[PDB]
């Protein structure tokens, strides 16, 4: 009757420590009448470590020093297994009933981890393989949103075979200045450049291509940055909106008309890309007042200071409640899958 929640967290990414803090916060909130936690952390080298709740972190109360305890207690997965799918290299691991994956980095976010969980017949929180993969490839994601008649910033995408052919003059005739250059898989922070003159382009394009084989060159979007949390599978619900001041203000200072249409666009975007469980949708609200999709993020932060849970808190859904609902959604999808 308690159900066992396998928290998988950490990962090879710059957001590793944010994942560590999400895990702790989630662990502290997990409804102890419904759920028991099993903790599997992933190293900055990609190695998996089973840990006790009481000792999964080093320097937990020091944000400059917080690290995973690399217990060396390894995990094996039995593809196709229907019970004890996750097994200790070496004696026994509690049966996991649902996985709540919060692994930032390429593999944890792009559908690879989701595929592994599917192979092991484990229910899990968040978007499936397709929704994760599409959302993470910003090129594919913009193309799908564009097809759904949602507004995205004008953009061109280069691979290395085609990046050597890039003409700044033509790109700036089409997209303007400044240009935003970023790798297609990742590209919030890492490998990103705001190019202000055509001279700076060649370097931005080269830096982006060190992080991915595909690079986006995007027009600027002038407008207010608004963020909206979505939750659900087939009938998603949208939270109150928050405004980024440059630092988030909840609820945003916008009309009810305007919050409602942002909420509507957030749900439509989430449906188009095939998201499930949760996502944060970031938009620009222009002068204007056209609404343009900036990003759909299928792995939001789950720390107590993160935007996604704060948006739900401001909509009257408490953290504990939010975690419980995400786990319910994961089980609902899983069971529905089981009849197909």
Buried b vs exposed e over 250-278: b needs ≥16 C-beta within 10 Å? bebebeeebbebbbebbbbbbebbbbbbb
Beta bridge partners of 228: 241, 281
Least separation, in Å, of the C-beta of 293 and a second copy? 15
If you compute the radius of gyration of the chain from its CA atoms, what whole number of angstroms results?
A: 21
Q: What angle do CA 290, 147, 109 make, to 5 degrees?
A: 95
Least separation, in Å, of the C-beta of 64 and a second copy? 26
Binder of a second copy out of 124, 211, 308, 319 (CB under 8 A): 211
Work out the angle between the directed axes of helices 129-136 and 256-273 (0-180°, nearest 10). 110
Binder of a second copy out of 144, 275, 285, 299 (CB under 8 A): 144
Least separation, in Å, of the C-beta of 212 and a second copy? 6
Residue 331 binds a second copy (CB under 8 A): no
Count the residues of the shown chain that bind a second copy, applying the rule CB under 8 A: 51
Binder of a second copy out of 130, 156, 244, 286 (CB under 8 A): 130
Q: Pattern of binders to a second copy over 53-92, x per CB under 8 A?
A: ---------------------xxxxxxxx-----x-x---
The beta strands (E) that lie in 32-178 are given as: 35-42, 48-51, 57-58, 67-68, 75-77, 86-88, 98-103, 155-159
Residue 212 binds a second copy (CB under 8 A): yes
Question: Minimal CA–CA distance to 297: which of 227, 238, 239, 233?
Answer: 227
Q: Pattern of binders to a second copy over 217-236, x per CB under 8 A?
A: -----------------xx-
Q: Are 244 and 198 in contact (CB under 8 A)?
A: no
Question: Minimal CA–CA distance to 82: which of 100, 97, 99?
Answer: 97
Give the residue with the Cβ less far from a second copy, 82 or 257. Answer: 82
Q: Name residues contacting a second copy, limited to 16-55 (CB under 8 A).
A: 42-43, 45-48
Q: Are 279 and 230 in contact (CB under 8 A)?
A: yes
Least separation, in Å, of the C-beta of 267 and a second copy? 13
Rounded to whole angstroms, how far apart are CA atoms 126 and 109?
Answer: 10
Q: Summarize as ranges the residues that interact with a second copy (CB under 8 A).
A: 42-43, 45-48, 74-81, 87, 89, 107, 110-116, 118-119, 121, 129-130, 133-134, 136-137, 140, 143-144, 146-148, 159-161, 210-213, 234-235, 274, 336, 340
């Amino acid at each position: 009757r308690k159900i066992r929640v396998g928290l998988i967290f950490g990962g090879k990414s710059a957001e590793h420590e944010v994942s560590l803090q999400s895990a702790r916060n989630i662990l502290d909130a997990l409804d102890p009448q419904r759920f028991e936690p099993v903790l599997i952390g992933i190293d900055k080298q990609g190695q998996w470590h089973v840990n006790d709740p009481d000792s999964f972190l080093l320097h937990a109360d020091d944000p400059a020093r917080i690290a995973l305890h690399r217990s060396g207690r390894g995990v094996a997965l039995l593809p196709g297994a229907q019970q004890q799918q996750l097994r200790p290299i070496q004696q026994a691991l509690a049966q996991i009933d649902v996985v709540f994956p919060i692994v930032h980095g390429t593999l944890g976010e792009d559908g690879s981890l989701q595929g592994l969980l599917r192979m092991a017949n484990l229910p899990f929180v968040g978007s499936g393989v397709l929704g994760s993969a599409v959302a993470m490839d910003k090129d594919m994601a913009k193309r799908v949103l564009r097809d759904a008649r949602l507004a995205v910033a004008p953009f061109v995408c280069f691979d290395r075979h085609t990046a050597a052919h890039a003409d700044v003059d033509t790109l700036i005739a089409q997209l303007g200045l400044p240009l935003f250059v970023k790798p297609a898989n990742q590209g919030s922070s890492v490998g990103v450049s705001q190019v202000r003159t055509a001279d700076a382009f060649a370097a931005a394009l080269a830096l982006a291509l060190a992080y991915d084989h595909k690079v986006l060159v995007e027009a600027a979007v002038a407008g207010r940055e608004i963020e909206c949390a979505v939750l659900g599978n087939a009938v998603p619900h949208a939270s109150v909106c928050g405004e980024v001041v440059v630092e988030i203000v909840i609820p945003a200072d916008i009309d009810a008309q305007t919050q409602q249409r942002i909420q509507q666009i957030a749900v439509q975007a989430y449906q188009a890309l095939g998201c499930a469980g949760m996502a944060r949708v970031d938009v620009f609200l222009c002068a204007d007042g056209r609404i343009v999709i900036n990003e759909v993020n299928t792995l939001p932060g789950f720390t107590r200071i993160s935007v996604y849970p704060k948006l739900w808190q401001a909509s009257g859904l408490d953290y504990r409640g939010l975690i419980t609902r995400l786990i319910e959604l994961a089980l609902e999808r899983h069971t529905d899958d089981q009849l197909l």
